[PDB]
Design a protein around this nucleic acid. Sequence first.
RNA 1: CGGUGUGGCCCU
RNA 2: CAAAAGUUGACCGAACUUGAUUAUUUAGAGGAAGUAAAAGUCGUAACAAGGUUUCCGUAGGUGAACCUGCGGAAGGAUCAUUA
RNA 3: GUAUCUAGGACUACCAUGGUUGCAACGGGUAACGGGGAAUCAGGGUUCGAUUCCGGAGAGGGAGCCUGAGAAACGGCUACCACAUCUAAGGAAGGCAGCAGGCGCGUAAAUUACCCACUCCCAGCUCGGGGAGGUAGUGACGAAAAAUAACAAUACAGGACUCAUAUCCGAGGCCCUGUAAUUGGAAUGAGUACACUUUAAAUCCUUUAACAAGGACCAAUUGGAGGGCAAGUCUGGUGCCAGCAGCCGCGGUAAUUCCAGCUCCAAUAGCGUAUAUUAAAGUUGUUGCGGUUAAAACGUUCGUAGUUGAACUUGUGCUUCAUACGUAUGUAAGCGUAUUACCGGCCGGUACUAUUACUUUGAACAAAUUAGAGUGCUUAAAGCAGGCUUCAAAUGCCUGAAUAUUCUGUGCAUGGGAUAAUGAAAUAAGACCUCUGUUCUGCUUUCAUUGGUUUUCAGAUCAAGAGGUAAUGAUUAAUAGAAGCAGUUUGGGGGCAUUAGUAUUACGACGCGAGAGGUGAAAUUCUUGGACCGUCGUAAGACUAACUUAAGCGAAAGCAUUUGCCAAAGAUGUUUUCAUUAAUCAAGAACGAAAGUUAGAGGUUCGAAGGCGAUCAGAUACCGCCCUAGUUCUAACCAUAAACGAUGCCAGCUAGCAAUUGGGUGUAGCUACUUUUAUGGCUCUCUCAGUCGCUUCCGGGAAACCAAAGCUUUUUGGGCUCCGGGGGAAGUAUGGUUGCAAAGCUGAAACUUAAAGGAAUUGACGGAAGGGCACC
Lengths: 129, 143, 150
Amino acid sequence: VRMNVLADALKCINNAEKRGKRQVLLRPCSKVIIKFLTVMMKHGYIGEFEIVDDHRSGKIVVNLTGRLNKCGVISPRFDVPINDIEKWTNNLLPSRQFGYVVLTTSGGIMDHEEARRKHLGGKILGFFF
Amino acid sequence: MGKPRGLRTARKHVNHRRDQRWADKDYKKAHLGTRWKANPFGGASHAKGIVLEKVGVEAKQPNSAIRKCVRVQLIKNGKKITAFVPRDGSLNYIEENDEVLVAGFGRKGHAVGDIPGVRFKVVKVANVSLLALYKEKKERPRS
Amino acid sequence: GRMHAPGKGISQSALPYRRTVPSWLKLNADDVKEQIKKLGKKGLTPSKIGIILRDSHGVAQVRFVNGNKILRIMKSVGLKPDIPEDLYHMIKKAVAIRKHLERNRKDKDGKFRLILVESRIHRLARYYKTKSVLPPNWKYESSTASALVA
RNA sequence: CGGUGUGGCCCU
RNA sequence: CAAAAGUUGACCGAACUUGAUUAUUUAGAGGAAGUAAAAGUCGUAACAAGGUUUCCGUAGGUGAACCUGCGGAAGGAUCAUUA
RNA sequence: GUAUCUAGGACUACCAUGGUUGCAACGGGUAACGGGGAAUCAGGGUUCGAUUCCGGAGAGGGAGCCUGAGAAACGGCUACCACAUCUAAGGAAGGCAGCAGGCGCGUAAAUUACCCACUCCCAGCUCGGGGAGGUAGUGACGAAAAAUAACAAUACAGGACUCAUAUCCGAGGCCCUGUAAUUGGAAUGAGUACACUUUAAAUCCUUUAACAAGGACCAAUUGGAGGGCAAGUCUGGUGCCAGCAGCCGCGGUAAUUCCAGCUCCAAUAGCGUAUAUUAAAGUUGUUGCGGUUAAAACGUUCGUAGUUGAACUUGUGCUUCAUACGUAUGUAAGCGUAUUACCGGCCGGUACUAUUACUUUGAACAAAUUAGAGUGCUUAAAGCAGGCUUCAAAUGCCUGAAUAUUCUGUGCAUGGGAUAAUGAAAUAAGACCUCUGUUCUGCUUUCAUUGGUUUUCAGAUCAAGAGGUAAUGAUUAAUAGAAGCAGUUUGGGGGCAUUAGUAUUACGACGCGAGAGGUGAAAUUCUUGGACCGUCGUAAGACUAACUUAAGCGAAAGCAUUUGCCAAAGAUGUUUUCAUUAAUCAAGAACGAAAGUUAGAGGUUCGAAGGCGAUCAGAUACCGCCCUAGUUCUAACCAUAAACGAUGCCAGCUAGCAAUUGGGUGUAGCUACUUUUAUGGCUCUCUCAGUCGCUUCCGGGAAACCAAAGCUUUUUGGGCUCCGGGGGAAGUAUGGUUGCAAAGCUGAAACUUAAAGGAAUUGACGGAAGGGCACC
């Protein structure tokens, strides 16, 4: 059963560049997922992604540029306040230099350093580098 | 393949710890409450005992050695205690039926050297500091 | 998938994209609203009501010519009976268990198959118990398997 | 295609 | 008028004496396992095809190790053609 | 209703028949007073915290109670009970877990001190008093500080240095560097003691007159020194002795581990022992491992309590400016609209809002401790002191004693509207902003005061319009799932009739002749006239071979004669229906070949056990001969197997290649003749469910092996359950629970042990395979 519609969508992206699949056939077009792929394009991690919509769910095509290493996911959505976001950096990132964990607070979906300027505590969905 | 990553699961998830505390066989050393049972002097550091008799033990194979061991009774719980003397000689420093202090043997409770069934080592005899008697720092009282 | 089974197998229909075609169909939603008053009054189940309109006339999809689901098309002219249709096939399939296994016992393969449709009632009927399509204090009893279907 | 058990303990 | 001693009703209830009951301990003639077993006696099971191929759910039996029958498995020695 | 200062099943009486629980309730168990708090590192911590702070409790065991505001008080009393007091024998007295003492006890712990100066307290009280509280003697439990000399040439050896000379070589050598009981210069303060100081007084610390080192004194060790793990293959001694030693192992006559000496080292006023505890230990783990086999998936499938759940449910823009720098966009307003109703000058006050979880800023909320901002107590550990042209007067202001984390949490405000569910309008509310009633509940004001009488008002709520504008009110059916189906069907799946096929077993009869069977070999056994043999024939019960597959069906065990029957499932087919009906799962309910029991059948092959022949040293066995339990089918009863693919199940992706099962589909295929056709067969093409095999990671593992055992890599994450932490103790005890039994679901401990094993390489061209050699 499709338990979490978030995480299963993430991993097949990581199961593309290893054999070098420059494209991704992807399902099933949720609006929380559409709020997420542009964050990759907000730092230029993938290629062009497009979404056809059948009148059941929709499905996603994703091209890839090949700059990724691994996108990940913590499960389920742990609740994280402001004063303890830094714990989820060092356990999830290679360093403070690059990479981005991505949570979502009551204001929306963002980067952690974006959230470190927006200052509103929220829930982890995933991470990538 | 298993482990319970559900969020609202914690009421399962510390019952399933304690149900497997006594698998780790070096963690029942105090948890079952047996330190008053069979650590043969009662769960303290050392034991103000009394000498019973000098016993003729033999070392483990392939080592034909005779460790010249002693028998102890205790005034704390009153059982039979088999101890061991270092630093060859000192059987003439025993002077049997003496109020003896006896410590452990330095493995947290097992047979250490080639020496079976002896889970102790002496450090004191007759309240007069057994260790410094070979180097003759303290004069040994005889009577 | 395939709950009571080893198979991963998958078989279903395939609905098309648009929601109005057949536009060439001169038939409206109104004569088929009489056809359910004509055909569905003869005791037919909501599935096989929807299969005679496909082959004969043939409307591809009544959901495109009319908005309501077909039970509501049963209800809005008054053809929803007391019993939901799909368990009514299961209980008939359940009552054939107490016709084969009443005399011809030792069929523990067949006697396995009682535990399915009793469970395939009791998980399924728990859903329809909630949805207020039949009231609670509806307990399936073993003697009732004859008379619920007959 | 016939049988056939045993080898005191310790030596870079 | 106040008013001691003596005391009826209770009222809570010390301690006294049986019975049952909780765990920790405790004797015990014979019974029966474990390791210590290494200088003991009788065999030779298992490991090569261990010289009778092994192996488990159980039955029945002999000093033992085991043997024996039914149903299986490859940790087998057969990944095997063989028209 | 009683009592009680008062709630009250507090408790009496009358009444009801309830509170509570697999979200571990009641039951026991703890070498368990809670807590503020304490110790260790990267976090998460696991241990504890008796003990100065706070709070709750007890004064031997227990229990009543006076007095007072206030005890169920014990440095108040009473009882009894325990253990002890005195007595003239009539009586009286008793709790140190207050202080300092002893006694006992156990590894285990201080003066029968001084003082009310400090801090607080007591009252009639400035004044009295307080082993509170302060100080001292006790104390290597601790923490902090820091003495063992410093300096000189010669010296004696090494080097640079100048230089002879250079595979060599020395001298000018020499800042240096050592050894120097060589020589010193002797720098000094602990000891030392006037006086002083501080103190209730006194000591001690600081200050200090007089004292104070050629060391032998003014004198540091404790443990090591084979490897771990730092540093004599020095010596004597010793000979598997004594020992050593955490482990690995050293000692068996020329010892690197023993005993000494030797030097070397370690840390140093500290070293060591044992003992619990955390770290090492990512070997208690969510982060953070493991399950093919190294320890390890219930055999099984459903199945609630569990727990986790699809998607879909108001916004990008549009214009401008603050604004980065023609450009950008991260800014606010306008603009695709409750951007709420009103009075105010865009701007104050007021009408006035489906929730949670979550997070926002917070509020409240002892310190002390931790962290710590300040801060030259001589420094530190402290501690909150003190700093200050002031130098010639001090009037000399202040800084202070902060700040948050353990002041974790729940809950009590507020921000915010992502995530996470919940939440309307389908036996009918779609609304009416509302003049609103075709309800009625009135409700208080003016009728100076007051009501009989009724309207405005109806503060209003409950009928109520045909004041019905009403897109009037129902998300897609998921490569979710379930049901449906001319459906075409499939299969050694089941049930249940009915049925076939050779053997074999004797038997029957004929035939013929003395052998037959069996073994490595024989023997046990059959046979004079008729075995074994040939032959037909009668039954008889078991089995359903061949066809049998790296086929298939089934959930797994298992499951093969025909044919009918009675069903049920899976797969494709489907522009059927349904609207999340879900996945997996403690407890639990169906099913599990035999083996094996419980009565009742039926008896063929065979057959544990039991006899007998060989063989052997023995055979109680491997081989034979006989039959016995039983396999057989009916009725049930245990329910375990290596019940194995030694790998649980459902969602996704990632690689081919080749077979083959079904179902589809295209032959722009042949073939078949009923005819070119038709149904039909095969071949090709496509297709889903695959399952097998093979290929190579280019994945992963310790490897063989693996397409999943991969995606558990980056100290990682798709869900859910059991389940392992070294051996052997041991799947044994002890009880429960279940069985008619044999037995199962269940499952430890003292003790004992340093290894048991995981794959792989090598020794076996060590009676083991294949091929080749001499009269060892």
